[PDB]
Amino acid sequence: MTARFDLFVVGSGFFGLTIAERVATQLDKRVLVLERRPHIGGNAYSEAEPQTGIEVHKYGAHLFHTSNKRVWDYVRQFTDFTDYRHRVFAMHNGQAYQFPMGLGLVSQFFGKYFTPEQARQLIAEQAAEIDTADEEKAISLIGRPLYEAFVKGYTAKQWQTDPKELPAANITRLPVRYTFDNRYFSDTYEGLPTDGYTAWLQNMAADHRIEVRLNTDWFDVRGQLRPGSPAAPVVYTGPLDRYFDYAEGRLGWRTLDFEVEVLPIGDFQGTAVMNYNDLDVPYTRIHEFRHFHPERDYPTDKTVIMREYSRFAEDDDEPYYPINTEADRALLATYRARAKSETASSKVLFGGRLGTYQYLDMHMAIASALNMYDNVLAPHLRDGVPLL
Amino acid sequence: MTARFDLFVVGSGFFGLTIAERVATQLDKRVLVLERRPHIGGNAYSEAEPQTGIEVHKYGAHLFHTSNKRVWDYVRQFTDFTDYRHRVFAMHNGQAYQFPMGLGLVSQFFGKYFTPEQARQLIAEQAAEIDTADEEKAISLIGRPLYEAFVKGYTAKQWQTDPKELPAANITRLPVRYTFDNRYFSDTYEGLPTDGYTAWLQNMAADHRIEVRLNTDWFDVRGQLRPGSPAAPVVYTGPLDRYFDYAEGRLGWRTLDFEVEVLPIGDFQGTAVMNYNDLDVPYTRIHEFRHFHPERDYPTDKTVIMREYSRFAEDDDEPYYPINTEADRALLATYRARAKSETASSKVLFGGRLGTYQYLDMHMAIASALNMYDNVLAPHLRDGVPLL
Ligand SMILES: Cc1cc2nc3c(=O)[nH]c(=O)nc-3n(C[C@H](O)[C@H](O)[C@H](O)COP(=O)(O)OP(=O)(O)OC[C@H]3O[C@@H](n4cnc5c(N)ncnc54)[C@H](O)[C@@H]3O)c2cc1C
Ligand SMILES: Cc1cc2nc3c(=O)[nH]c(=O)nc-3n(C[C@H](O)[C@H](O)[C@H](O)COP(=O)(O)OP(=O)(O)OC[C@H]3O[C@@H](n4cnc5c(N)ncnc54)[C@H](O)[C@@H]3O)c2cc1C
C-alpha cells in the first residue's frame, strides 16, 4: 500500500516545525503538520497590528537567545537576526529601577552608591535575617527589603497565591549582580528575527514536502489519517494529560491574558518591557512593541502596548507554565509511563513543552527537536531502528 | 640623485600610521615615521600593567566607534574587535546615576518615574527659566536642577574655569534622551581591539617599507634627513604653532593628568568608566580597565584603576583638547596661511589633531588620513600632480 505521508507532526510551534523541517529536507519525506489554532507558530506567533503596522507578539514578548552554535547556525537558514539586546526595567512605588538586581537597583533603592564589595556585604547582612536552611527562602537569599519590594508582589501576581504559601523548593538561587551590567540575558547570541517570527515560522514550513493543516485538532482527524499512512510515526507536541483523556487527573498549569491597546502617543514607556512589581497593579508586565524594532520605520504619533496578566488556568484555558507541585510530578511520572507504551504500540513520540510538561524557551525547544531527530526519529525513518 | 625615503611622517598616532601604511603598501614607497615619544601610537597607546597584567590605556579611555563602513573595513585588516558596548555612569552626591541624561537619570534624580511625554514637559518647564536667545546657555537648554547636579561641577573641573566665565556659544545643544536607552555611542560599529591598541598600531607599521624611529623629534633631525631624500614630502602631525616657532603666539590647550593605582580587590566600581560630577572631587573620571575586556582571564583578586584630572596646560604640558577661544581661532587662521605657504615652498602637509588644532576621534583621524591619501598625497606620489 502506497502511503500518503511519511510522518505526522501534531503542533506547529518551534519543536514541531523543527521536527517537520529536518525530516522533510534531510530524509526527503512527506510530513503533515496538524495545528489546531487559526495560524502557525504556537506561542511564538506574531502579527502586525492594523492601525499602526507594528509587529506584536500575540502571546507575550518572545526574545531569542542561545549559546548553542548549532542552534544559531540552524535558525539563520530561515531568518536574519537583528542586533537587539534585551534590557528590562521594574516599576515599584512610582519609580522605575534598573533590573535585574545589581549595583544599579541596589544604589537606587537604598538611596546611595554601593561599591561591588559594599554591596556584597549589604546583601549578606540582610539575607542573614533568615537562614536558608530553616515569606520565604527568598528573604534568606536577598534580604527582607529587596524581597518585599521586587519579588513578593511580582511572585504573588504570577502564581496567584500568597508567597508564604508556595514551596521553598521553588527557588534555588536568587542572585544579585555585583556589577552595573544590566544585559538581561547572558548567552553568546541574541536578537530578534529581522522580518518577525511569523516569516521565520513560514520559512521553516515552506518546503513542498511539508503540509500544514490549520484549524485542525489531531484528536478529530487521527482516525481518518493514519489508515492511509499506517507506518508513519506521530510526533505529538500537544498536552500530555489531554493525550490520555485525563484518565489519571489533570496536570496543573498557569495562563496569561493579554490586553493589547493602541495609544494616540509615540512612546508609552521608553523601553520594550516594564515589570510591575506591586500587588496593587493587576498586570505583571507592559510590553511596548515599537522598541523591539527601532530599526523599522514605525509611525511616531501612535504606539501599541500589551498588558500581560497571570491567573489560575481553568480547564479550557491555554496552558503556559507548569505549576509543578509534588502531586503534579507523580501525575507526570504516571503519564510518562503511559507515553512509553504508546511509543512501543503506536509509534507516537512525545515532545515540546506541552508533550513533556516543562517550560522550554525557543532555543531549548529547537535543540530538543534536533536531539529527538538525531537520536530517535532519523534512525527509525532512514535505517530500521526501533523508536524505543 | 638616489633617495633614501619616499615620504616622511611626523608622529605615529592613528592619522600618521594610516598615511604611512597606505603609502608603503598601496604605492610601494619607503616611509620614515619620526616619533618623539618612546613608543608608537600617540595617545591611543596601551600597555600591560606589571602587577595584574591588565591592559591600561595610558592617555585615557579609548573606545572605538564608527558609522563609516570604509573605515570599519580598513581597521579590521589590522585587528579584530570585541562586542563591548560603552556605557557611562555618573557620580553625584554619593549616588550613581545612569548616563547620559535620559529617562533613567531623570527618574533617579527626581525620585519618581516620568513617562517619555512627562519628561519632555518637565524639561520644557525647567529650561523656561532662561531663554536661550538672551550658570549658562546650559540652564536655558535643560533647566537649573540638572545643570547644577550633572553639568556645572563637571565643566568646571574640565575647563578649570567657573562656567559663569565661559562662552555661551561653547554649547550648541544639550539633549535629554526621552527613552531608557543608555548606550553611550550612536554609531553602527563599535568595539575594543581584541589584542589591544598597541598590537593594532604595531600591525599598521609592520610593513618592511615603513621605518619608525622612536625618541626622535622632527625639529632635531629634519636638517639631516631632507637632503638625502629631497623630493619626499613631509606629513607633519605635531602642534601647528610649534612648527612655526610660536612666532605668532601660542594656541590654547587643556591637559590631563592620569593617576594609575593597583588595588588589592577584584572590582572597584563595577563598570569601565565613572564620571565624577562634583567640584569637591579633584578628578574628573575613574576608569577601571578589567571592564574593557571581560572576555580576558584577568585576576579576581586585583584590579587597576585610573583617575583622570583636568588642568590649565602650561607651556611644557602635553596638549589634549583645544581651548578654542575666539583668539585661538584668529591665531589658527594665521597659522593655516603659514601652513599653506609651507606646502607650496617645501612640500609639508599638516594633518591630525595637533597639526590641525582640532579634537579628533580615532575613526575621524583615520577617515581624515584616507582623505589626504586619496585626494592629495597618492596623486602626487603616483603621478606627479601638485600637492595644493
Ligand atoms: C508568555 C510566553 C513568552 C515567551 N517568551 C520567550 C522568550 O522570550 N524567549 C524564548 O526563547 N522563549 C519564550 N517562550 C517559549 C516559546 O513560546 C517556545 O517556542 C515554546 O514554549 C516551546 O515550543 P513548542 O513547539 O514545544 O510549544 P508551542 O509553541 O506551544 O507549540 C504547540 C502547538 O501545538 C498545538 N497543539 C496543541 N494540541 C494540539 C492538537 N491536539 N492538535 C493540533 N495542534 C495542537 C498548539 O495549538 C500550538 O500551536 C515564551 C512562551 C510564552 C508562553
Ligand atoms: C583623553 C583622551 C581620550 C580619548 N578617547 C577617545 C575615544 O574614546 N575614542 C576615540 O575615537 N578617540 C579618543 N581619543 C582621540 C585619539 O587619541 C585619536 O587617535 C587622536 O586624537 C587623533 O589621532 P592623531 O594621530 O591626530 O593624534 P596623536 O595620537 O596625538 O598623534 C600625534 C603624534 O605625533 C607625535 N609628535 C608631535 N610632534 C612631534 C615631533 N615634533 N616629532 C616627532 N613626533 C611628534 C606625538 O608624540 C604623537 O605620537 C582620545 C584622546 C585623548 C587624549
Side-chain angles (χ1 to χ4, degrees):
Chain A
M1 203 200 76
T2 307
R4 173 71 143 108
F5 311 99
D6 297 307
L7 218 201
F8 299 107
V9 173
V10 181
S12 74
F14 280 110
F15 188 99
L17 283 182
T18 305
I19 292 291
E21 183 277 348
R22 289 285 85 188
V23 167
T25 276
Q26 299 298 310
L27 303 175
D28 173 40
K29 308 262 187 203
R30 295 150 309 156
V31 184
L32 180 69
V33 189
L34 307 126
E35 166 59 56
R36 87 194 217 96
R37 289 179 187 174
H39 54 253
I40 64 173
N43 292 334
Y45 174 77
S46 68
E47 197 157 57
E49 187 283 320
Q51 301 179 51
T52 58
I54 293 175
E55 180 207 323
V56 169
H57 301 350
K58 182 172 196 291
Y59 307 93
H62 282 251
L63 305 312
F64 191 75
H65 65 276
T66 186
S67 291
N68 191 321
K69 183 71 190 315
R70 171 183 191 183
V71 174
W72 187 235
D73 276 3
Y74 179 61
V75 297
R76 282 142 92 219
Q77 301 182 208
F78 310 104
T79 191
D80 297 339
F81 289 86
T82 251
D83 291 327
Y84 182 80
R85 282 211 201 165
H86 197 47
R87 280 165 166 86
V88 175
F89 286 82
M91 198 83 64
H92 169 64
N93 218 52
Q95 174 70 113
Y97 290 88
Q98 306 158 252
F99 200 77
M101 309 198 171
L103 286 192
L105 180 142
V106 167
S107 60
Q108 271 198 257
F109 188 65
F110 290 113
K112 62 159 227 218
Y113 165 67
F114 298 83
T115 255
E117 189 50 36
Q118 287 159 4
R120 268 172 205 281
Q121 297 179 107
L122 173 68
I123 280 73
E125 175 68 66
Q126 296 183 353
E129 197 201 296
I130 295 167
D131 297 315
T132 285
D134 202 52
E135 299 300 322
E136 277 279 76
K137 202 128 161 234
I139 298 182
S140 83
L141 291 168
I142 57 163
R144 171 162 252 108
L146 290 182
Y147 166 77
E148 284 176 352
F150 304 97
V151 185
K152 189 178 182 159
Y154 201 77
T155 301
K157 298 191 288 189
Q158 292 178 137
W159 290 82
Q160 286 304 301
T161 72
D162 186 55
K164 280 203 293 295
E165 262 143 53
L166 288 179
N170 265 34
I171 281 172
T172 31
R173 287 129 101 274
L174 208 44
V176 173
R177 299 172 183 196
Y178 302 111
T179 245
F180 279 106
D181 186 24
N182 72 328
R183 167 144 184 208
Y184 197 80
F185 299 115
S186 41
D187 287 302
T188 318
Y189 312 107
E190 186 183 343
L192 290 170
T194 312
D195 302 328
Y197 282 95
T198 285
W200 170 12
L201 291 149
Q202 318 264 24
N203 260 114
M204 291 198 303
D207 189 274
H208 75 274
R209 284 100 127 210
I210 304 160
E211 307 210 294
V212 186
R213 248 182 226 191
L214 300 164
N215 300 294
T216 301
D217 181 336
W218 170 246
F219 308 94
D220 289 334
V221 291
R222 79 219 283 221
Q224 80 204 40
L225 278 171
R226 292 254 251 168
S229 323
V234 180
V235 177
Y236 180 77
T237 82
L240 212 204
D241 53 358
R242 205 281 170 243
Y243 192 91
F244 300 97
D245 298 313
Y246 307 113
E248 315 295 348
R250 319 183 159 254
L251 290 157
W253 283 91
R254 289 143 49 217
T255 9
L256 296 195
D257 303 313
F258 311 96
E259 289 185 351
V260 177
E261 188 170 21
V262 174
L263 306 172
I265 54 166
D267 206 341
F268 175 74
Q269 72 189 4
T271 20
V273 187
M274 193 65 78
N275 298 357
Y276 279 74
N277 306 280
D278 292 358
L279 233 194
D280 44 35
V281 172
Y283 39 95
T284 53
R285 328 181 83 186
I286 297 175
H287 312 279
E288 182 172 16
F289 284 108
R290 68 165 38 249
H291 290 104
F292 291 60
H293 286 101
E295 86 287 338
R296 292 186 179 161
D297 212 36
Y298 280 155
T300 48
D301 65 325
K302 275 179 302 179
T303 196
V304 189
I305 74 168
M306 202 175 82
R307 281 177 303 271
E308 161 171 341
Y309 303 75
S310 303
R311 65 189 166 77
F312 196 106
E314 322 272 323
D315 315 342
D316 172 286
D317 278 324
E318 185 66 30
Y320 300 97
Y321 316 110
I323 299 174
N324 211 44
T325 81
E326 185 165 321
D328 281 295
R329 290 190 291 271
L331 227 213
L332 167 61
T334 297
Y335 287 135
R336 275 234 248 265
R338 287 261 233 147
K340 187 220 181 74
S341 320
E342 188 79 8
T343 295
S345 84
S346 309
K347 287 145 150 182
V348 192
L349 301 172
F350 298 73
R353 47 172 269 272
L354 308 163
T356 255
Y357 192 62
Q358 254 35 271
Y359 169 75
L360 277 176
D361 287 309
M362 296 176 275
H363 70 297
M364 289 315 285
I366 294 159
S368 184
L370 295 179
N371 260 76
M372 169 172 290
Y373 171 75
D374 293 331
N375 299 127
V376 191
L377 239 199
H380 179 259
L381 290 173
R382 194 187 53 232
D383 306 333
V385 199
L387 275 176
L388 272 186
Chain B
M1 189 211 77
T2 305
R4 175 75 144 101
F5 304 100
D6 294 296
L7 207 227
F8 301 100
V9 181
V10 179
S12 64
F14 269 116
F15 187 102
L17 290 185
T18 303
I19 290 304
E21 185 278 342
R22 292 287 82 178
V23 168
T25 254
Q26 307 297 284
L27 268 17
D28 187 14
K29 303 290 185 210
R30 303 155 291 163
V31 187
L32 184 66
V33 181
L34 309 116
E35 171 57 57
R36 66 163 157 67
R37 290 179 184 171
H39 48 252
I40 54 158
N43 285 347
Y45 174 80
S46 67
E47 204 195 298
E49 185 287 328
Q51 300 181 52
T52 61
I54 298 172
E55 193 157 26
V56 162
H57 304 348
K58 188 189 193 296
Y59 309 86
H62 281 243
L63 299 317
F64 189 79
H65 65 274
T66 190
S67 282
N68 181 327
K69 187 66 188 315
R70 184 184 174 183
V71 166
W72 185 235
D73 282 356
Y74 178 70
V75 304
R76 280 133 103 218
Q77 300 174 211
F78 305 106
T79 190
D80 291 346
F81 292 84
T82 254
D83 271 11
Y84 183 81
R85 279 190 197 202
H86 199 46
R87 290 171 155 79
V88 175
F89 292 79
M91 195 78 72
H92 159 72
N93 246 55
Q95 172 62 122
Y97 292 89
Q98 286 190 299
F99 204 74
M101 302 193 178
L103 294 194
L105 177 146
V106 170
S107 64
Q108 283 189 264
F109 186 71
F110 299 106
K112 66 169 287 279
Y113 165 69
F114 293 83
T115 258
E117 214 358 288
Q118 281 166 1
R120 293 174 174 280
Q121 292 177 114
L122 179 76
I123 281 68
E125 176 62 50
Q126 293 181 352
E129 186 180 336
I130 298 175
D131 314 296
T132 293
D134 218 281
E135 326 329 336
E136 278 259 281
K137 180 91 147 284
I139 289 168
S140 84
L141 293 168
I142 62 181
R144 183 163 231 108
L146 291 169
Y147 167 75
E148 297 195 344
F150 298 103
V151 172
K152 187 175 197 172
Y154 197 67
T155 315
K157 285 186 299 187
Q158 291 188 123
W159 286 78
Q160 293 291 312
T161 310
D162 179 22
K164 303 192 205 219
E165 278 131 59
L166 287 169
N170 271 25
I171 283 146
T172 306
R173 353 101 139 239
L174 209 51
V176 176
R177 300 181 180 182
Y178 307 100
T179 62
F180 288 92
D181 181 17
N182 79 328
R183 192 176 161 180
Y184 193 80
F185 299 113
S186 266
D187 285 318
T188 316
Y189 317 103
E190 192 179 336
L192 294 175
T194 307
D195 285 315
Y197 286 92
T198 287
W200 170 10
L201 292 146
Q202 310 253 47
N203 255 56
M204 294 201 271
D207 194 275
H208 79 279
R209 283 156 302 193
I210 301 153
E211 255 216 53
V212 190
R213 338 237 255 234
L214 300 166
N215 296 304
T216 305
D217 199 319
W218 175 242
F219 302 98
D220 284 326
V221 289
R222 96 224 270 218
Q224 77 215 53
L225 284 169
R226 289 254 252 174
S229 312
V234 182
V235 186
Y236 174 79
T237 70
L240 217 199
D241 53 349
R242 204 270 165 253
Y243 190 96
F244 294 104
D245 303 344
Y246 312 100
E248 304 291 336
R250 291 202 178 233
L251 291 166
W253 291 86
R254 290 146 54 213
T255 355
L256 295 176
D257 298 323
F258 307 98
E259 281 192 7
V260 180
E261 188 173 4
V262 179
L263 305 184
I265 50 179
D267 205 323
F268 172 77
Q269 64 184 14
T271 21
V273 181
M274 188 74 76
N275 288 8
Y276 278 87
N277 299 282
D278 300 348
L279 222 201
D280 62 38
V281 181
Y283 43 83
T284 261
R285 333 184 75 187
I286 305 183
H287 316 288
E288 178 174 12
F289 286 105
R290 72 151 61 244
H291 288 114
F292 280 154
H293 282 98
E295 82 285 344
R296 291 186 178 163
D297 193 32
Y298 282 163
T300 52
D301 61 312
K302 280 168 261 146
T303 196
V304 188
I305 63 165
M306 190 172 87
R307 296 177 300 268
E308 184 175 313
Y309 305 79
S310 173
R311 48 190 263 274
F312 194 77
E314 316 265 349
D315 297 345
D316 44 47
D317 279 316
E318 199 61 40
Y320 295 113
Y321 308 121
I323 292 174
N324 204 37
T325 70
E326 172 171 331
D328 298 307
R329 289 195 291 274
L331 223 212
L332 179 56
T334 291
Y335 283 129
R336 276 209 294 236
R338 285 254 222 161
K340 187 231 199 147
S341 296
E342 191 75 341
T343 301
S345 66
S346 61
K347 300 196 220 295
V348 184
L349 302 173
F350 302 72
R353 56 178 272 265
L354 303 171
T356 254
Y357 189 67
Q358 304 285 315
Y359 174 79
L360 283 171
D361 275 327
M362 298 179 263
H363 66 293
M364 297 304 276
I366 293 159
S368 181
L370 295 175
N371 211 74
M372 168 184 284
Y373 173 77
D374 295 343
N375 304 137
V376 181
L377 246 196
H380 184 260
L381 296 174
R382 197 210 324 279
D383 285 305
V385 183
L387 285 172
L388 277 166

